[PDB]
Amino acid sequence: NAEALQLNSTEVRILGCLIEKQATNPETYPLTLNALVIACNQKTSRDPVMNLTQGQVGQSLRALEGRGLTRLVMGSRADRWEHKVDKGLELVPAQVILTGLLLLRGPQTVSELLTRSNRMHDFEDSEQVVHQLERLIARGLATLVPRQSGQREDRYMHLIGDPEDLQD
């Protein structure tokens, strides 16, 4: 019934940032366009580092809005934007955080996800993270990435972007 989103690298970055900043500084959220491009081009908490301009962010924001995944919040001071990933993909906040982490940075291990979600959602332990990821997988929104020699820890990745990024 429900097909794949195949969001581009910009749309992926945007949603990540909306989720991140909603959790990490609510006082700044919904994000203005400029706050959003700053969040997109950040050196830290980003893989990879981007350099998207205002117009790229603006059109991906309108493109997303059309898909029901962003919502324009108009106001007297300036337009601010919010994500609609929870309502849109029917996800509990824990799943929205994890998805956010995976969008921002790609394939991550459970312990990385636990550490990075620390000031965003409070997973009491790595069992709760797995609980939630298993559901994302059952949903068709994340995936366990097969490991091989180099690392002896599972990695997880989201299924919301270009599926050819996951293809060798």
PDB file of C-alpha atoms in Angstrom:
ATOM      1  CA  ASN A   1       0.000   0.000   0.000  1.00  0.00           C
ATOM      2  CA  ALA A   2       2.761   2.449   0.974  1.00  0.00           C
ATOM      3  CA  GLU A   3       5.623   3.087  -1.505  1.00  0.00           C
ATOM      4  CA  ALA A   4       9.175   4.412  -1.064  1.00  0.00           C
ATOM      5  CA  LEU A   5       9.923   8.121  -0.675  1.00  0.00           C
ATOM      6  CA  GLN A   6      13.283   8.289  -2.383  1.00  0.00           C
ATOM      7  CA  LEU A   7      14.019  11.780  -1.075  1.00  0.00           C
ATOM      8  CA  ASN A   8      17.085  13.545  -2.553  1.00  0.00           C
ATOM      9  CA  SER A   9      20.152  14.446  -0.556  1.00  0.00           C
ATOM     10  CA  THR A  10      18.771  17.933   0.210  1.00  0.00           C
ATOM     11  CA  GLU A  11      15.325  16.877   1.292  1.00  0.00           C
ATOM     12  CA  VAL A  12      17.000  14.239   3.454  1.00  0.00           C
ATOM     13  CA  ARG A  13      19.275  16.912   5.114  1.00  0.00           C
ATOM     14  CA  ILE A  14      16.395  19.320   5.694  1.00  0.00           C
ATOM     15  CA  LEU A  15      14.109  16.805   7.545  1.00  0.00           C
ATOM     16  CA  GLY A  16      17.077  15.674   9.652  1.00  0.00           C
ATOM     17  CA  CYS A  17      17.739  19.255  10.741  1.00  0.00           C
ATOM     18  CA  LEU A  18      14.070  20.004  11.467  1.00  0.00           C
ATOM     19  CA  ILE A  19      13.971  16.943  13.743  1.00  0.00           C
ATOM     20  CA  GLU A  20      17.313  17.766  15.327  1.00  0.00           C
ATOM     21  CA  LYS A  21      16.625  21.434  16.142  1.00  0.00           C
ATOM     22  CA  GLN A  22      13.058  20.735  17.316  1.00  0.00           C
ATOM     23  CA  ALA A  23      14.614  18.452  19.934  1.00  0.00           C
ATOM     24  CA  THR A  24      17.811  20.347  20.716  1.00  0.00           C
ATOM     25  CA  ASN A  25      16.599  23.915  20.665  1.00  0.00           C
ATOM     26  CA  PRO A  26      12.767  24.130  20.644  1.00  0.00           C
ATOM     27  CA  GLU A  27      13.059  27.908  21.167  1.00  0.00           C
ATOM     28  CA  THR A  28      14.391  28.203  17.615  1.00  0.00           C
ATOM     29  CA  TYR A  29      11.748  25.863  16.142  1.00  0.00           C
ATOM     30  CA  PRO A  30       9.945  25.942  13.673  1.00  0.00           C
ATOM     31  CA  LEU A  31      13.061  26.987  11.796  1.00  0.00           C
ATOM     32  CA  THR A  32      13.279  30.090   9.589  1.00  0.00           C
ATOM     33  CA  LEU A  33      14.809  29.523   6.160  1.00  0.00           C
ATOM     34  CA  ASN A  34      18.213  30.973   7.200  1.00  0.00           C
ATOM     35  CA  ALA A  35      18.361  29.067  10.501  1.00  0.00           C
ATOM     36  CA  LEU A  36      17.597  25.967   8.399  1.00  0.00           C
ATOM     37  CA  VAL A  37      20.403  26.495   5.899  1.00  0.00           C
ATOM     38  CA  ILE A  38      22.844  27.102   8.772  1.00  0.00           C
ATOM     39  CA  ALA A  39      21.639  23.803  10.316  1.00  0.00           C
ATOM     40  CA  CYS A  40      22.109  22.063   6.911  1.00  0.00           C
ATOM     41  CA  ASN A  41      25.705  23.262   6.302  1.00  0.00           C
ATOM     42  CA  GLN A  42      27.040  22.563   9.778  1.00  0.00           C
ATOM     43  CA  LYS A  43      30.539  21.199  10.231  1.00  0.00           C
ATOM     44  CA  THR A  44      29.574  18.997  13.260  1.00  0.00           C
ATOM     45  CA  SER A  45      26.854  16.304  13.612  1.00  0.00           C
ATOM     46  CA  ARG A  46      26.700  16.136   9.770  1.00  0.00           C
ATOM     47  CA  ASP A  47      27.762  13.367   7.326  1.00  0.00           C
ATOM     48  CA  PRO A  48      28.533  14.585   4.874  1.00  0.00           C
ATOM     49  CA  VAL A  49      29.261  18.274   5.307  1.00  0.00           C
ATOM     50  CA  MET A  50      27.112  20.246   2.874  1.00  0.00           C
ATOM     51  CA  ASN A  51      27.013  23.725   1.306  1.00  0.00           C
ATOM     52  CA  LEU A  52      23.443  24.185   0.181  1.00  0.00           C
ATOM     53  CA  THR A  53      22.375  27.716  -0.713  1.00  0.00           C
ATOM     54  CA  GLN A  54      19.096  29.449   0.199  1.00  0.00           C
ATOM     55  CA  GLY A  55      17.261  28.637  -3.071  1.00  0.00           C
ATOM     56  CA  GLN A  56      18.135  24.957  -2.909  1.00  0.00           C
ATOM     57  CA  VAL A  57      16.811  24.819   0.661  1.00  0.00           C
ATOM     58  CA  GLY A  58      13.749  26.898  -0.312  1.00  0.00           C
ATOM     59  CA  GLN A  59      12.711  24.622  -3.212  1.00  0.00           C
ATOM     60  CA  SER A  60      13.321  21.360  -1.355  1.00  0.00           C
ATOM     61  CA  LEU A  61      11.211  22.878   1.427  1.00  0.00           C
ATOM     62  CA  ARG A  62       8.380  23.614  -1.050  1.00  0.00           C
ATOM     63  CA  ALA A  63       8.926  20.195  -2.661  1.00  0.00           C
ATOM     64  CA  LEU A  64       8.633  18.515   0.756  1.00  0.00           C
ATOM     65  CA  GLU A  65       5.638  20.635   1.669  1.00  0.00           C
ATOM     66  CA  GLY A  66       3.894  19.284  -1.419  1.00  0.00           C
ATOM     67  CA  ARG A  67       4.579  15.739  -0.152  1.00  0.00           C
ATOM     68  CA  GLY A  68       2.968  16.605   3.215  1.00  0.00           C
ATOM     69  CA  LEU A  69       6.320  16.371   5.084  1.00  0.00           C
ATOM     70  CA  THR A  70       6.921  20.032   5.800  1.00  0.00           C
ATOM     71  CA  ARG A  71       4.497  22.707   6.861  1.00  0.00           C
ATOM     72  CA  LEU A  72       4.962  26.392   6.275  1.00  0.00           C
ATOM     73  CA  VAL A  73       4.236  28.416   9.404  1.00  0.00           C
ATOM     74  CA  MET A  74       3.471  31.993   8.417  1.00  0.00           C
ATOM     75  CA  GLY A  75       3.929  34.868  10.791  1.00  0.00           C
ATOM     76  CA  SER A  76       4.615  38.574  11.025  1.00  0.00           C
ATOM     77  CA  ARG A  77       8.404  38.235  11.734  1.00  0.00           C
ATOM     78  CA  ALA A  78       9.283  35.698   8.952  1.00  0.00           C
ATOM     79  CA  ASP A  79       8.279  32.314   7.553  1.00  0.00           C
ATOM     80  CA  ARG A  80       9.298  29.417   9.742  1.00  0.00           C
ATOM     81  CA  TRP A  81       9.105  25.768   8.805  1.00  0.00           C
ATOM     82  CA  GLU A  82       8.288  22.614  10.665  1.00  0.00           C
ATOM     83  CA  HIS A  83       8.652  18.914   9.810  1.00  0.00           C
ATOM     84  CA  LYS A  84       5.720  16.501   9.699  1.00  0.00           C
ATOM     85  CA  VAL A  85       7.599  13.190   9.939  1.00  0.00           C
ATOM     86  CA  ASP A  86       5.721  11.897  13.002  1.00  0.00           C
ATOM     87  CA  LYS A  87       2.279  12.511  11.477  1.00  0.00           C
ATOM     88  CA  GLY A  88       3.514  11.744   7.933  1.00  0.00           C
ATOM     89  CA  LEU A  89       5.286   8.418   8.621  1.00  0.00           C
ATOM     90  CA  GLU A  90       3.225   7.592  11.758  1.00  0.00           C
ATOM     91  CA  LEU A  91       6.177   7.377  14.126  1.00  0.00           C
ATOM     92  CA  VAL A  92       6.500   7.617  17.934  1.00  0.00           C
ATOM     93  CA  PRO A  93       8.930  10.440  18.977  1.00  0.00           C
ATOM     94  CA  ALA A  94      11.772   7.864  19.635  1.00  0.00           C
ATOM     95  CA  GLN A  95      11.477   6.665  16.025  1.00  0.00           C
ATOM     96  CA  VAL A  96      11.414  10.283  14.761  1.00  0.00           C
ATOM     97  CA  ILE A  97      14.668  10.965  16.711  1.00  0.00           C
ATOM     98  CA  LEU A  98      16.410   7.839  15.421  1.00  0.00           C
ATOM     99  CA  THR A  99      15.226   8.534  11.837  1.00  0.00           C
ATOM    100  CA  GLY A 100      16.611  12.113  12.318  1.00  0.00           C
ATOM    101  CA  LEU A 101      19.972  10.755  13.480  1.00  0.00           C
ATOM    102  CA  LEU A 102      20.159   8.321  10.482  1.00  0.00           C
ATOM    103  CA  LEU A 103      19.193  11.087   8.017  1.00  0.00           C
ATOM    104  CA  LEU A 104      21.884  13.419   9.367  1.00  0.00           C
ATOM    105  CA  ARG A 105      24.723  10.964   9.473  1.00  0.00           C
ATOM    106  CA  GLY A 106      23.894   7.716   7.702  1.00  0.00           C
ATOM    107  CA  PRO A 107      24.756   4.146   8.843  1.00  0.00           C
ATOM    108  CA  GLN A 108      25.193   4.173  12.554  1.00  0.00           C
ATOM    109  CA  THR A 109      25.770   1.657  15.236  1.00  0.00           C
ATOM    110  CA  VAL A 110      23.386   1.253  18.204  1.00  0.00           C
ATOM    111  CA  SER A 111      25.924   2.766  20.640  1.00  0.00           C
ATOM    112  CA  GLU A 112      26.415   5.803  18.362  1.00  0.00           C
ATOM    113  CA  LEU A 113      22.660   6.222  18.126  1.00  0.00           C
ATOM    114  CA  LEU A 114      22.336   6.000  21.897  1.00  0.00           C
ATOM    115  CA  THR A 115      25.110   8.577  22.428  1.00  0.00           C
ATOM    116  CA  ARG A 116      23.896  10.908  19.739  1.00  0.00           C
ATOM    117  CA  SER A 117      20.239  10.858  20.873  1.00  0.00           C
ATOM    118  CA  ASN A 118      21.237  11.714  24.448  1.00  0.00           C
ATOM    119  CA  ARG A 119      19.968  15.316  24.522  1.00  0.00           C
ATOM    120  CA  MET A 120      17.030  14.573  22.152  1.00  0.00           C
ATOM    121  CA  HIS A 121      15.263  11.495  23.520  1.00  0.00           C
ATOM    122  CA  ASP A 122      16.145   9.533  26.541  1.00  0.00           C
ATOM    123  CA  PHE A 123      16.786   5.910  25.771  1.00  0.00           C
ATOM    124  CA  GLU A 124      17.315   4.287  29.089  1.00  0.00           C
ATOM    125  CA  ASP A 125      19.458   1.681  27.357  1.00  0.00           C
ATOM    126  CA  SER A 126      20.473   0.204  23.984  1.00  0.00           C
ATOM    127  CA  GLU A 127      17.618  -2.336  24.286  1.00  0.00           C
ATOM    128  CA  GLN A 128      15.095   0.487  23.785  1.00  0.00           C
ATOM    129  CA  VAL A 129      16.996   1.700  20.736  1.00  0.00           C
ATOM    130  CA  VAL A 130      16.859  -1.796  19.160  1.00  0.00           C
ATOM    131  CA  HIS A 131      13.171  -2.147  20.049  1.00  0.00           C
ATOM    132  CA  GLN A 132      12.506   1.014  18.065  1.00  0.00           C
ATOM    133  CA  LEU A 133      14.788   0.196  15.153  1.00  0.00           C
ATOM    134  CA  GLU A 134      13.289  -3.225  14.696  1.00  0.00           C
ATOM    135  CA  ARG A 135       9.930  -1.498  14.257  1.00  0.00           C
ATOM    136  CA  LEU A 136      11.429   0.961  11.710  1.00  0.00           C
ATOM    137  CA  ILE A 137      12.676  -2.072   9.770  1.00  0.00           C
ATOM    138  CA  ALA A 138       9.324  -3.824  10.013  1.00  0.00           C
ATOM    139  CA  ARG A 139       7.939  -0.526   8.625  1.00  0.00           C
ATOM    140  CA  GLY A 140      10.275  -0.426   5.672  1.00  0.00           C
ATOM    141  CA  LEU A 141      11.935   2.762   6.875  1.00  0.00           C
ATOM    142  CA  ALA A 142      15.231   1.509   8.086  1.00  0.00           C
ATOM    143  CA  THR A 143      17.456  -1.451   7.495  1.00  0.00           C
ATOM    144  CA  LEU A 144      20.209  -3.404   9.147  1.00  0.00           C
ATOM    145  CA  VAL A 145      23.318  -2.904   7.122  1.00  0.00           C
ATOM    146  CA  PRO A 146      25.314  -6.113   6.687  1.00  0.00           C
ATOM    147  CA  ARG A 147      28.663  -5.741   8.436  1.00  0.00           C
ATOM    148  CA  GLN A 148      31.979  -7.229   7.374  1.00  0.00           C
ATOM    149  CA  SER A 149      35.535  -7.522   8.752  1.00  0.00           C
ATOM    150  CA  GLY A 150      36.581  -4.022   9.733  1.00  0.00           C
ATOM    151  CA  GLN A 151      33.761  -3.682  12.279  1.00  0.00           C
ATOM    152  CA  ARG A 152      32.147  -6.222  14.661  1.00  0.00           C
ATOM    153  CA  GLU A 153      29.084  -3.981  15.371  1.00  0.00           C
ATOM    154  CA  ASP A 154      25.813  -3.846  13.391  1.00  0.00           C
ATOM    155  CA  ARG A 155      25.039  -0.670  11.463  1.00  0.00           C
ATOM    156  CA  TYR A 156      21.588   0.711  10.682  1.00  0.00           C
ATOM    157  CA  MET A 157      20.514   2.920   7.821  1.00  0.00           C
ATOM    158  CA  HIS A 158      17.252   4.656   6.842  1.00  0.00           C
ATOM    159  CA  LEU A 159      15.232   3.732   3.771  1.00  0.00           C
ATOM    160  CA  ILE A 160      13.868   7.210   3.032  1.00  0.00           C
ATOM    161  CA  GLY A 161      16.548   8.388   0.558  1.00  0.00           C
ATOM    162  CA  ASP A 162      17.836   7.406  -2.884  1.00  0.00           C
ATOM    163  CA  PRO A 163      17.955   3.610  -2.800  1.00  0.00           C
ATOM    164  CA  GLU A 164      20.939   3.631  -5.222  1.00  0.00           C
ATOM    165  CA  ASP A 165      23.048   5.142  -2.411  1.00  0.00           C
ATOM    166  CA  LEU A 166      22.765   1.774  -0.694  1.00  0.00           C
ATOM    167  CA  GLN A 167      23.631  -0.116  -3.924  1.00  0.00           C
ATOM    168  CA  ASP A 168      27.216  -1.098  -4.886  1.00  0.00           C
TER     169      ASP A 168
END
